[PDB]
Scaffold this active site. Sequence first.
Site, PDB file in Angstrom:
ATOM      1  CG  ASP B  32      -1.958   1.075   1.212  1.00 22.76           C
ATOM      2  OD1 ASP B  32      -1.998   1.851   0.254  1.00 22.76           O
ATOM      3  OD2 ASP B  32      -2.776   1.134   2.154  1.00 22.76           O
TER       4      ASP B  32
ATOM      5  CG  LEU C  31       0.316   8.493  -7.541  1.00 23.94           C
ATOM      6  CD1 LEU C  31       1.769   8.652  -8.045  1.00 23.94           C
ATOM      7  CD2 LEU C  31      -0.665   8.290  -8.695  1.00 23.94           C
ATOM      8  CG  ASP C  32      -4.146   4.392  -1.788  1.00 20.74           C
ATOM      9  OD1 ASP C  32      -3.385   3.459  -1.439  1.00 20.74           O
ATOM     10  OD2 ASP C  32      -5.142   4.756  -1.137  1.00 20.74           O
ATOM     11  CB  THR C  33      -0.626   0.168  -4.557  1.00 20.60           C
ATOM     12  OG1 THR C  33      -0.027   0.220  -3.252  1.00 20.60           O
ATOM     13  CG2 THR C  33       0.301   0.796  -5.610  1.00 20.60           C
ATOM     14  CB  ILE C 101      -4.592   8.118  -8.448  1.00 19.08           C
ATOM     15  CG1 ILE C 101      -4.784   9.599  -8.851  1.00 19.08           C
ATOM     16  CG2 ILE C 101      -4.496   7.250  -9.692  1.00 19.08           C
ATOM     17  CD1 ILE C 101      -5.955   9.869  -9.749  1.00 19.08           C
TER      18      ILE C 101
END
EC number: 3.4.23.-
Lengths: 8, 116, 116
Positions: B32, C31-33, C101
């Site tokens: 994350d 930006l956020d996995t 995102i």
Amino acid sequence: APQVXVMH
Amino acid sequence: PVIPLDPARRPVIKAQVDTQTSHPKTIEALLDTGADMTVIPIALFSSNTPLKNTSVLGAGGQTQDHFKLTSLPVLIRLPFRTTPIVLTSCLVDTKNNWAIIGRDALQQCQGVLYLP
Amino acid sequence: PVIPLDPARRPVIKAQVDTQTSHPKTIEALLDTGADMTVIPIALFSSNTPLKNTSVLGAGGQTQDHFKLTSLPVLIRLPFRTTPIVLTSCLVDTKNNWAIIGRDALQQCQGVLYLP
């Protein structure tokens, strides 16, 4: 605070 | 490795986590880039670990209840590496919903985001 | 562009968001996995657009109230890219706190995570 991010 | 990003499949990895309060255990953790700090489940910890109260900001606002901070460092080993990530402190999910490797850990293993 | 990950610096991007309910605006987005889908501030939508109830899970647990789902697709254009990301749907922050995102958008960018 620390941020921690998103689930549906 | 290179981990593609897909809304339907969360980018997760196996990790061995040593809280230094019981034997190291295997978890499946979410990778994350939107987490400032790593979160591990409270289920990892022995019954009488001193954990500190803390606030955490997430999607629905600030929570005081859900997370504690470790007092001791946590060591984390990823699949094909003997060298541990060592985090001076990390968040502990008291609800055991979340295991999340955040930018603190990703920094240590030189993880990057890449957008072509 | 390679984006190094650092707990002290959030990985952000400037993005032009077109809610199709109002003039497009460029915002700074995380930006956020660890985000299943992208989040846009409600302030980017016209007063009294139809928006759908939705539940979202985040760090403080589940919220029924904080987020809506859009009725129309949201187009997103990154720096120096003409082609829009087209999101069938995405989340709308009714508290104007978050621009995120998520993997839905990152998949269309062909963004990846890389752990050496």
